[PDB]
Design a protein around this ligand. Sequence first.
Ligand code: SF4
Ligand SMILES: [Mg+2]
Length: 303
Amino acid sequence: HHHHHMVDEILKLKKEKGYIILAHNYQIPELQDIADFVGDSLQLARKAMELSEKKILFLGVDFMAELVKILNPDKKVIVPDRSATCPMANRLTPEIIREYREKFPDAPVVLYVNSTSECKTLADVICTSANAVEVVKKLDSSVVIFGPDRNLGEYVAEKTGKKVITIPENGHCPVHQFNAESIDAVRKKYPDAKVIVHPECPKPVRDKADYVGSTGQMEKIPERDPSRIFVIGTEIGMIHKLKKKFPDREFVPLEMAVCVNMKKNTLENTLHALQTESFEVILPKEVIEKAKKPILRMFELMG
Ligand code: SF4
Ligand SMILES: [Mg+2]
């Protein structure tokens, strides 16, 4: 670290004001280092239920911050940049959900966490990339509506054998659109490397990988796989996380992939957030009341 002033002041204010700092795995290394907890969306959702502080500084994108607020309606949740969002999530609308419910009335609506809070009020259950398979398996229906990510939906259909109707038309994460050629090239360069990719990746990339999982799942792979070299097909922030957790291994990006929205949070605007205790996540009471149900069901159907 080479920003000792910013770091020391962030720590001072966090302590003075009674904040816990939660971060997603795609946040810059300097922010992961000052965070009290870093993880994927499922790990963040569980932490949001368990934590005991009354004030939360959240470092990620808006849908995630809103989930934390939904689970903690009487706590203060702040974010440094209110424009930090997921472009994929924003393409699915209430109107598309109602259209598909009318077409396939027997199918439960399973929404990825990457979805607007208004859309969550219209979901039967929420999932993350780590538990989507388990959640869909547990439901009675042989058919489900799934969105907004077509790739994760298709992965779920493969693993569960259920019919998955994806919405909207070609909803997808641009960050995870790697080329399968990139895997061919690393197999030639590193013949006993293992390739780990996200389920948001396209089918040809998933199929050529050794492992497919959420970032939380990726972090567990070196606990069971002794490979000297791992090649990682996700957003670049996870490669730092992995290097720090397993300094004895080599982690190589499959390609450079950056989520510009995840990178909106900086040391500078994080300090400003603590100085001013802004920007608070504010949601209407009715949204909190209606969206909590599919979120709590995710955990209820896990175990
Ligand atoms: S990496 Fe993709 S799915 Fe994740 S927040 Fe960024 S745009 Fe959304
Ligand atoms: Mg129905």
